Structures are given as C-alpha cells and as structure tokens.
Amino acid sequence: MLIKVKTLTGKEIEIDIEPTDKVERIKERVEEKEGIPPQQQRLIYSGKQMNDEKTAADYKILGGSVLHLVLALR
Amino acid sequence: NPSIQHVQDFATLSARSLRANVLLNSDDHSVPIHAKNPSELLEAIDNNISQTAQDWGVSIQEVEVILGSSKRIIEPVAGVTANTIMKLFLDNDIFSYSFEKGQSLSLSQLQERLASLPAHKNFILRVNDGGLGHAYVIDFPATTNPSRDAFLYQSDLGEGVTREVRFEDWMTQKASHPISLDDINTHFIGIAQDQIDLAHIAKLFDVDGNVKMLRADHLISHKTSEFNFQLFEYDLKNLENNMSIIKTH
C-alpha cells in the first residue's frame, strides 16, 4: 500500500508498505531516499509520535495516509 | 586547515540567519547549495504548514509547535547536517550531492581506499553508522606530513548511544580535534566487536569526551556492521566558492 511521508517543505516521499510492517520499515525506506538514519527521524501521524517497533496496522496507517517527517532536534 | 573553518562559519551563520538556516535544513537535493532560493524554501514551508493545519483541523500555531515553522531557527538532526555538509564541499553548477544517488562502499572497500589516499588530494566521507543510528562526515584534507589527520563534523538527535549535540556546538568545541585513520578504522571495526570501547566512542563523538554521557544499552546490536559509506574527492576552492556565495544572502 502507498503512503506519503511529507517533509517540512511539503516534499512528498512515496512509500510502499504492508499493514504488518513495523514503523521502523517505513524509516528504512525514508533513509534510502533521504539519507537520514531511522533513529535520527521522527515520524508524526496526525499530531502523534509513533513507536517504531509497532506496525502500520497498530497505528491505522492505510493506503493514502500521510505521515510527517520531523528532522529537528527536540 | 581552511576547510574546517568554512564549515564552522556555515554552522555559525545558519544558527543566526533564517535564510542560511533554511539552507542548512533544505531537502531539494537536486538543487546545488549555491543555487538554492531561501525565499521559495521558506514559502514552501509556510504552504505546507497552512495545508497541514487545514488537513488536521487545527490552527497554524498548533501545527507549528509540532512540525516547526519558517520563522524559527531549526537545529538539524544528524543526517540533514551530513547531507548539507556534503553539498558545501561538492556542489557546483554541474553537481548536486544527493544521498540516494551516491555509490556506497563496503567496509573492505573503504579500508582500502583510505589506506591508499594520495597525499596531495582532499577527500570527504559521508557515513551512516548502523549501530549508532547516526550520520556524520569525515574531512581528510590534503597533507604534506607522513600520515593524515581527519576531522569529524556532525549534529545528533541524541536518542542512541551518543547524546544530543547541535551542529554549531560541535563545530565550535570539538570539530577541529584531529583523528587518525587508525582512530576511524578502530571505530568501524570495534563497533561490531563483542566488546565496544565506550571510551573511543566518547573521544570521537562526544562534545566533552565524556563517557558518562553515553548509553551503551542503546546500541542497535543487529546493525553494528551496516554502514553507508560515500567517499569523494574534493577541491577546497569549490567549498570556498560555495561559502562566498552563501555569505551574500
């Protein structure tokens, strides 16, 4: 299923995943495109941070969902 | 060692100028750094924020507290600083560095290239380090002297073994401390060993060399031998030219 990870500048990174994929896999495919280690990325899904060890299904990330990639220090 | 000074100057400028800071945090990787348009980048941010407030059913202000904004200095995490520094060194009118296009080397290949660098040429290595969940750049300026000093540049979100460090704090405290090929090689080999040497991690990566700030329990054990290594030759006058152009925003 195709989701969009949007950066702060609104740049859209398409990503193909499965419901049982860990959120960590989404971070791996963002790393392939952007160069950011997964542990340096923060992914926001409608206002909420996510646990990388949970799955796309746990968080109800579906086809056409849009996640936001935060790349700033806390 | 004029290259380190250029990176310091960039770190200090990008900490106080929104224009230079949106360059530091840019992700239009196909556009070379000298040719980026900070006005358009900041507008892109405002458009994204405004769209996202409408998408989330909340105010612009609420989205800005979560995602950031175009009117606030943003401190980059490690991979963004590492990409932007590669661009400072390498970008020009016919080249625009992007992580996804670069050829990665295996550790074996990198160890050979590094053990055999010509003395009169400058090199720069971008690293993603699987075990540390980290990214950083190593600058190998041309040298006359028997063996080469190198300089590590970074910032870090601080969720791993290493703690949080701002690009500018790093640059102005510890980036000019030289490290040998031995020190570097030791890290890449050692990080996959049974025992890791936390002292050596603190020496390379911690801004106070303080081993007590590290968290050995955050090592990502199954990735300790996964790196991405991208090694380039660079010409010092290209870095200097990018900095002179940037110095006119």
Curated annotation (Swiss-Prot), chain A:
The lineage of its organism: Eukaryota, Metazoa, Chordata, Craniata, Vertebrata. It is found in: Nucleus. Interacts with AHR; interaction is direct. Interacts with NUB1; interaction is direct. Interacts with ESR1. CDD domains: Ubl_NEDD8 (cd01806). The record marks L8, I44 as: Interaction with UBE1C. Keywords: Acetylation, Isopeptide bond, Nucleus, Ubl conjugation pathway. GO terms for biological process: anatomical structure morphogenesis; modification-dependent protein catabolic process; protein localization; protein modification process; protein neddylation; proteolysis; regulation of postsynapse assembly; regulation of proteolysis. Cleavage of precursor form by UCHL3 or SENP8 is necessary for function. (Microbial infection) Deamidated at Gln-40 by bacterial cyclomodulin Cif produced by enteropathogenic E.coli, Y.pseudotuberculosis or B.pseudomallei, leading to impair NEDD8 ability to activate cullin-RING-based E3 ubiquitin-protein ligase complexes (CRL complexes). Deamidation occurs on NEDD8-modified cullins. NEDD8 deamidation prevents switching from the inactive to active state by maintaining the 'closed' structure of the CRL complexes. Deamidation may also impair its deconjugation by the COP9 signalosome; However this result needs additional evidences. Belongs to the ubiquitin family. The gene is NEDD8. Residues 70-72 are annotated as: Interaction with UBE1C. Highly expressed in heart, skeletal muscle, spleen, thymus, prostate, testis, ovary, colon and leukocytes. The modification N6-acetyllysine is found at K48. The modification (Microbial infection) Deamidated glutamine is found at Q40. GO terms for molecular function: protein tag activity; ubiquitin protein ligase binding. This is Ubiquitin-like protein NEDD8. Pfam families: ubiquitin. Signal peptide: none annotated. Disulfide bonds: none annotated. One of its GO terms (cellular component) is cytosol. Ubiquitin-like protein which plays an important role in cell cycle control and embryogenesis via its conjugation to a limited number of cellular proteins, such as cullins or p53/TP53. Attachment of NEDD8 to cullins is critical for the recruitment of E2 to the cullin-RING-based E3 ubiquitin-protein ligase complex, thus facilitating polyubiquitination and proteasomal degradation of cyclins and other regulatory proteins. Attachment of NEDD8 to p53/TP53 inhibits p53/TP53 transcriptional activity.
